[PDB]
Ligand binder design. Structure first.
Ligand SMILES: [Zn+2]
Length: 96
DNA sequence: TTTGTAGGACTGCCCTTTAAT
DNA sequence: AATTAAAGGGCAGTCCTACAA
């Protein structure tokens, strides 16, 4: 049997693995909901990590891995970090 | 039988902006 | 002006499941 893309697939295969739509309603887990257990599991394994979208910062010399560390260190809200980094009154900038 | 797959369904952690003080 | 709690918007890592192999 031949697949819509042209390659030969098993008579039972609805499409080659390469043509298989897995987006939206086509995903095998589409419209499903996760249990409180699964949620809890995921939760535990994500604890301790840092997202890829952090920004190294330098507080007039003292550098941190992310704004949150800068905030937790100075003991301020994360929004105030943003404020200062933009204020001309502070020497706070995000590192390359 | 078993395995691989990819995106849906989620998470922690993150950054910014807004309201309200 | 200075500050913060929430709401807005993000990202890769985890789980989960039907289907090709
Ligand atoms: Zn195909």
């Amino acid at each position: 049997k031949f697949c819509k893309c042209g390659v030969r697939i098993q008579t039972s295969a609805y499409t080659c693995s390469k043509c298989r739509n897995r987006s939206g309603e086509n995903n095998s887990f589409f419209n499903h909901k996760h249990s409180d257990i699964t949620k809890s599991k995921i939760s535990e394994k994500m604890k301790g990590k840092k997202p890829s979208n952090i920004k190294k910062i330098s507080c007039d010399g003292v550098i941190f891995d992310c704004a949150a560390d800068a905030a937790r260190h100075f003991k301020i809200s994360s929004g105030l970090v943003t404020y200062r980094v933009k204020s001309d009154k502070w020497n706070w900038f995000y590192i390359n």
